[PDB]
Design a protein around this ligand. Structure first.
Ligand SMILES: Nc1ncnc2c1ncn2[C@@H]1O[C@H](COP(=O)(O)OP(=O)(O)OP(=O)(O)O)[C@@H](O)[C@H]1O
Lengths: 858, 431, 99, 128
């Protein structure tokens, strides 16, 4: 039986090498647009993909289950897959026989008539003012503007409009377009030929290197005012090289650039005030464009078509490209289509092919390791929004995230992937998480349709709706399933090799299908369903992600200890009370979500690698527990509850916390009273970046001593409720370097009967660098707070003002960037005649400010 | 057949008779009525000193009676439950109850007994425990009313956390144990609001504490309300069958308090405020659709009512409130619950009129047999009762709004109750 | 007999993939005007066409008739056509010269 | 049982019981139909019109009748939406005034029509 072991080891190593080679080939193939592949390579690539799936499964089985029967099965599968690989190779070799270029579809749009653009005037004039901006604009240094957004939004159209409008007030100009994979010689020759068609008429035939072309451009632009537009920049090196030709200084010249990428725009412009962000049209403008496009002369929509029109316009989203293409589709110049045909289109040609080809540029440009992470978005329903933590943990579980470096955490890699997807304008971010990051994301609908078609053409994902998207006609091997309409019934007797199941139905029939037959699973996601108990979760042996959130589960089988591979375990909103003991024996576990009302077993110290722990109970617990807490060393998020926890042992807890070197966020929730932990001389962890005490009824005393800017060099969030605030407490907050967000409560003002005291700031300038929001709830003063001009980035101020102090000046010209102020007045001490006086006074003080912020007196 | 509603406008003439009748008969003395809301039923002339020493005698008799039962329950017990421990508890109970002592000693011993009763074999065992707690805090209320204890110390006693976590537990559990079967047989248990618990003479003392906090610290009063509603949901007075969004969790009260101190948070909400307001709008929508089930609508009404009564203005959204016009609907349902509770009180009082009903119909130790209000029909009673029920229904029929979307929750309970009452009044009036 | 059923299925799936590839090649060839093809490719393409016909017939027979005699005939035909395909491949490789 | 029937030509419809005319309603993906009404008893036309209204996808339809008044396709019929061609080549069996379901809402698509009415009004061409 020894030789069995050795043979199996050898076979597995061979498979690993073969997998590397296959992935290299597939990544190489997947770059070519579909119009340049031939059928042979496409078919062969599909078959290679299937073989890759099978070999991955075999390798995983060996890694998990390692006896006689297992080794025998593994050897059988090994032999079979090797045979199939050889056969496919011969097949390809048998029928191999060796035996122009199209133009960019976006080129025709430059010759569209100008009387067909609907709502440009406003944006056009705003951009023009952003360019000139004054009377002596012809004497200021060179300036660069940039425009960003997603495809089809109308960037080059706006640039063309402004250029044609104001080109008269310059000497020379040009309008050049850079593509995805550019040749720098061609770009420089284009600039030269655009500057003077007569002198450099034959410049496209010259053969010099880039240095001499750059020298020519520099010599021609000497002592001239120029306006130059550069279009469709796709990365950084291109701009880094082209920037050399505009190195000299020239008073009065202007540059414009347009792009889809945000970092490129940040690299072009100097200040973040020189960035224009395109935004979609409003509803009325979109509707007029639609009507004009189709009902062109009548401009009268019949009534029966109103509501389908509105739903279609909502699906378009205000993007002119989609509006135009769908309007041409429904126009059918011969005849307007019928209402039922409109419905059919809504539920579900040259212009359509062009739109698809245009939008796919951003997909064909991604790095190879980001393409699966994008297709994975086709699992979720249409219009809802997606939590990012769910996405990141599922990506890690599926195996899309990996690296070879020794000192890297997969969580931050996944976060980087998400931020990169947002950076390329393919995802709309929404909200702010409770750990300082994005909360959720949204996807445009046409993009969603493109993604669904792409992922369906490769058996990446199979969706189950009843009206559309039924079971594939001829497919025996399905890997990832997504149940959205519970009306259907599922066979699930041929789906031996599943990998991931997800149910989106509130329906009872959703829990009907049997799961214990998918002997190889990695992702089980039943969030929201009404399943009641799962005893079959053991015997799965392959899981990585177990998501049970918002389900009616009362208790877990005491066999989860068998799942030696389990990254995530999500239990929130369930009815569980006490976790089974065997949970201690899950050595690989990186994330544990739980409610504070659940009892944890004793030996929690063994769970190293824990990177996220949510809502510890910390009640009815002895000391060895709080000492074990000090062993989880690589832990980046923590949340406590202090509910029944006895505040006599806080010192051990603070030492255990100070033991965690890597850490970003921290919460402490306390019902009432004075917080008896985190005493002075604590030495917080160095990398801390976010701190919060959301209690609002449990105070600190004067202030923690460890808030000095040396101990907490990094901090971008703070939320504290003190007992009594001093005047030289805000000073210590001025000392903090970053402190983007801040919120302080004065406990004595509300709960006790103390009165609002005016704090005074002194002895310094630039007190609050990078403070965009501040909420001094309980304590307020506008002028004396900010002397000389400090915090030149604030945008929202919250302060309190007694009516007694009607007779201090409310001048808002210390602070340039003000945009919103929320005030509340205390009127019992002073009479109403002083009250309305102070009201009108601060109103005028807000009106004088040039930015003209908004007020609220409350 | 449905008996038609009485249609009378309230007269001071019969007001006099009904007023002295309520002021004379025992159970209606310590309770107040909805009819106090009417224009002219004035002239109460009541003094609380006599009612107070009456309550003293009632408490003495009831503690003595339960002690009597405790000895013999220790005599023959099915698995010894250390009944002499509860006996020592009632021993120190009577001790503290009889003597005058210094305020500090009373504080210490009250806190000790209460904190050690804090920490399942028999059911009436637990009933005895609950009655011990209720009698202890009744002693507290009487002692405060006896001017032997200041206000400062009373607050320092009640405002500390553990006492707050006990008041609600007792206030809900005792009411359940005492009235649930009566409410079920009467068929009104589906209309039982924690808001109107302290309107029975059995729970007047609680009311005192309540206004005391409205005296001094409104925050703690609202906290006590938010606590007692959650405790009522927990012990199954109103089953929702899945989960409560915002009542059992500690981090929800924090958000509610934060909003209550600075309201502008509602305009610029955080995430927890966001999903709070989403759940509120969803429950509102569920409440304002007529062919959803009755239990869901009642549950939604109870939740929204508690939120609005303790945290004012959070449930309000200006525009849609007028198109829906649900505010007056809420008031109508509240009025219905109040009047239904009073009708149940009258129905329970009727049992005192039975020739053979020595057994109390209110609950364990509700009334000591030393008083045991008798069968003696008096001159006025036979007329005053029917007049009072007719006046109740007449006063109710006016303020209720009439629309079938809202008719389902306020009209038919009143109609069915009027039917049951008009059917069973005579048969009891004969014999 | 269980083993035979398992084998025939595998052979049929292999034939289906091979048919896809052959049709791709033939469609690619049939675009060139006759004045630019050379004789070798033309002859090889004719033979490939004939093999395609035979394999289609075998697949159809399996789909319609599906026992022992049928499965035996189908297995025989399967083996023979696979052999012929290999032989034609070697033949083409033997006399290919780029010039 | 013959589902998938997409074209059916010249049904007999004579000496037939009701379960036959009810079965006719099961052929759902059927795009062409032709009837004869030869010996078919005109007492059961309602079941026939329901069975026809059950076919969602449909383009052409014929009804041939020897003589007399056509006693089927009564008003309140709800024809299939996609209908595009309709013909009654009888020329000796009339309708009464006009079917009510000829309004342009119920038949948005129609490129062919052939009818023989008993007596034409002046406000009948209007509906056309
Ligand atoms: N205001 C408008 N009114 C009518 N049509 C418009 C308007 N703005 C843009 N379009 C149309 O949208 C189409 C695409 O716009 P355009 O190509 O300028 O966007 P883009 O930002 O350049 O896209 P990409 O990022 O792919 O280059 C053009 O055909 C143009 O006619």
């Amino acid at each position: 039986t020894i030789t069995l072991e050795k043979k199996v080891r050898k076979g597995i190593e061979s498979l690993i090498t073969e997998l590397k080679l296959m992935q290299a080939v597939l990544s190489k193939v997947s770059k070519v647009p579909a119009d340049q592949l031939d059928e042979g390579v496409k078919i062969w690539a599909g078959n290679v993909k299937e073989l890759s799936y099978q070999m991955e499964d075999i390798v995983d089985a060996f890694m998990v289950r390692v006896n006689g029967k297992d080794l025998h099965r593994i050897s059988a599968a090994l032999e079979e897959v090797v045979l199939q690989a050889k056969q496919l190779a011969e097949l390809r070799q048998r029928y191999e026989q060796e035996m122009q270029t199209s133009v960019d579809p976006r080129m025709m749009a430059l010759y569209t008539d100008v009387t067909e653009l609907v709502g440009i005037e406003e944006t056009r004039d705003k951009l023009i003012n952003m360019l000139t901006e004054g009377d002596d604009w012809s004497k200021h240094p060179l300036k660069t503007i940039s425009i960003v957004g997603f495809g089809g939004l109308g960037k080059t159209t706006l640039a063309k409009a402004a250029y044609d409008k104001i080109k008269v007030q310059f000497d020379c100009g040009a309008f050049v377009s850079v593509s995805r994979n550019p040749e720098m010689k061609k770009v420089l020759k284009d600039i030269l030929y655009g500057l003077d068609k007569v002198k450099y008429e034959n410049i496209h035939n010259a053969a010099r290197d880039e240095k001499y072309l750059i020298d020519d451009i520099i010599e021609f632009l000497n002592d001239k005012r120029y306006l130059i537009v550069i279009d469709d920049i796709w990365n950084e090196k291109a701009w880094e090289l082209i920037k050399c030709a505009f190195s000299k200084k020239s008073p009065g010249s202007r540059l414009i650039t347009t792009t889809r990428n945000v970092s490129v725009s940040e690299a072009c412009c100097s200040s973040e005030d020189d960035i224009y962000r395109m935004e979609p049209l409003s509803n009325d403008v979109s509707r007029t464009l639609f009507c004009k496009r189709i009902f062109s002369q009548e401009e009268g929509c019949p009534q029966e078509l109103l509501k389908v029109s509105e739903e279609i316009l909502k699906k378009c989203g205000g993007v002119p490209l989609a509006i135009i293409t769908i309007a041409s589709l429904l126009a059918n110049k011969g005849h307007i289509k019928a209402k039922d045909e409109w419905y059919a289109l809504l539920s579900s040609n040259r212009s359509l092919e062009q739109m698809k080809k245009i939008l796919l540029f951003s997909y064909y440009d991604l790095p190879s390791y980001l393409k699966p992470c994008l297709l994975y978005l086709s699992i979720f329903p249409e219009d809802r929004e997606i939590r990012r933590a769910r996405l990141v943990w599922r990506w890690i579980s599926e195996g899309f995230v990996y690296s070879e470096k020794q000192d890297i955490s997969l969580y931050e890699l996944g976060d980087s992937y998400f931020n990169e997807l947002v950076n390329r304008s393919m995802i709309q971010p929404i909200g702010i998480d409770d750990e300082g990051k994005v909360k959720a994301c949204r996807v445009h609908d046409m993009v969603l349709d493109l993604i669904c078609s792409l992922s369906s053409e490769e058996n990446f994902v199979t969706i189950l709706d009843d009206p559309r998207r039924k079971m594939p006609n001829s497919e025996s091997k399905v890997r990832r399933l997504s149940i959205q309409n519970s009306k259907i019934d599922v066979d699930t007797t041929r789906m031996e090799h599943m990998r991931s199941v997800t149910v989106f139905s509130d329906n009872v029939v959703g829990k009907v299908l049997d799961i214990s037959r998918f002997k190889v699973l990695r992702v089980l996601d039943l969030e929201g369903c009404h399943v009641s108990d799962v005893g079959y979760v053991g015997n799965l042996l392959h899981l990585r992600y177990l998501g049970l959130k918002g389900t009616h589960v009362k208790d877990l089988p005491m066999e989860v200890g068998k799942l030696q591979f389990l990254l995530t375990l999500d239990l929130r909103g369930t009815k569980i009370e006490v976790l089974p003991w065997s949970v201690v024996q899950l050595r690989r576990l990186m994330c544990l979500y739980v409610d504070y009302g659940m009892k944890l077993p004793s030996g929690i110290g063994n769970l190293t690698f824990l990177e996220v722990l949510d809502d510890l109970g910390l009640s009815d617990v002895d000391l060895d527990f709080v000492k074990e807490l000090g062993r989880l060393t690589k832990l980046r998020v923590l949340r406590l509850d202090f509910h029944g926890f006895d505040q006599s042992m806080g010192k051990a807890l603070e030492e255990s916390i100070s033991n965690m070197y890597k850490l970003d966020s921290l919460d402490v929730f306390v019902n009432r009273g004075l917080i008896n932990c985190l005493s002075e001389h604590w030495v917080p962890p160095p990398r801390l970046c976010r701190l919060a005490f959301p209690s609002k009824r449990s105070w600190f005393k004067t202030l923690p001593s460890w808030i000095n800017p040396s101990s907490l060099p990094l901090l971008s969030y703070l939320d504290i409720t003190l007992f009594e605030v001093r005047s030289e407490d805000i000073q210590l907050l001025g000392t903090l370097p970053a402190l983007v967000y801040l919120e302080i409560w004065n406990y004595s003002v509300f709960e006790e009967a103390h009165e609002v005291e005016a704090p005074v700031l002194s002895s310094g300038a630039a007190l609050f660098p990078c403070a965009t929001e501040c909420r001094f709830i309980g304590i307020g003063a506008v002028p004396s707070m900010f002397p000389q001009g400090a915090a030149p980035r604030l945008k929202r101020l919250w302060f309190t003002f007694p009516a007694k102090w009607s007779s201090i000046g409310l001048g808002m010209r210390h602070l340039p960037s003000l945009q919103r102020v929320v005030v509340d007045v205390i009127s019992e001490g002073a009479s109403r005649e002083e009250a309305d006086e102070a009201e009108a006074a601060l109103r005028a003080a807000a009106e004088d400010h040039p930015n003209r912020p908004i007020l609220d007196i409350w | 057949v449905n008996f038609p509603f009485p249609k009378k406008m309230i007269t001071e003439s019969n007001s006099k008779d009904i007023r002295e009748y309520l002021a004379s008969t025992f159970p209606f003395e310590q309770q107040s009525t909805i009819l106090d809301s009417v224009k002219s039923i004035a002239k109460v002339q009541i003094d609380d000193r006599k009612a107070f020493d009456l309550q003293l005698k009632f408490r003495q008799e009831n503690l003595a009676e339960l002690k009597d039962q405790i000895i013999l329950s220790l005599g023959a017990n099915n698995g010894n439950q250390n009944w002499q421990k509860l006996l020592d508890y009632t021993n120190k109970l009577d001790e503290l109850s009889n003597t005058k002592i210094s305020p500090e000693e009373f504080i210490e011993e009250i806190q000790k007994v209460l904190y050690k009763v804090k920490l399942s074999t028999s059911k009436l065992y637990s009933q005895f425990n609950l009655s011990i707690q209720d009698f202890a805090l009744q002693i507290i209320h009487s002692k405060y009313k006896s001017n032997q204890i200041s206000q400062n110390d009373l607050l320092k006693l009640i405002t500390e956390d553990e006492m707050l976590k006990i008041l609600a537990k007792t206030k809900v559990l005792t009411y359940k144990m005492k009235y649930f079967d009566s409410a079920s047989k009467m068929g009104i248990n589906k209309y039982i609001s924690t808001e109107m618990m302290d309107l029975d003479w059995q729970f007047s003392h609680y009311k005192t504490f309540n206004d005391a906090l409205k005296k001094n610290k409104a925050s703690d009063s609202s906290y006590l309300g938010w606590l007692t509603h959650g405790y009522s949901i927990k012990y199954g007075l109103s089953p929702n069958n899945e989960r409560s969004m915002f009542f059992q969790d500690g981090r929800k009260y924090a958000e509610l308090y934060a909003f209550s101190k600075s309201p502008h948070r509602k305009i610029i909400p955080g995430e927890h405020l966001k999903d709070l307001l989403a759940k509120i709008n969803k429950s509102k929508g569920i409440f304002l659709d007529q062919n959803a089930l009755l239990d869901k609508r009642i549950y939604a009404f109870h939740e929204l009512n508690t939120l609005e009564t303790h945290f004012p203005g959070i449930t309000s959204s200006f525009t849609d409130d007028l198109k829906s016009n649900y505010r007056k609907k809420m008031e109508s349902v509240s009025l219905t619950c109040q009047v239904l509770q009073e009708i149940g009180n009258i129905h329970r009082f009727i049992e005192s009129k039975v020739p053979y009903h020595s057994s109390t119909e209110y609950g364990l130790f509700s009334i000591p047999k030393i008083f045991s209000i008798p069968i003696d029909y008096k001159h006025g009673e036979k007329e005053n009762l029917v007049s009072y029920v007719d006046f109740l229904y007449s006063t109710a029929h006016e303020r209720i709004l009439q629309d079938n979307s809202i008719n389902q929750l306020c009209l038919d309970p009143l109609q069915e109750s009027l039917n049951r009452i008009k059917s069973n009044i005579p048969v009891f009036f004969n014999l």
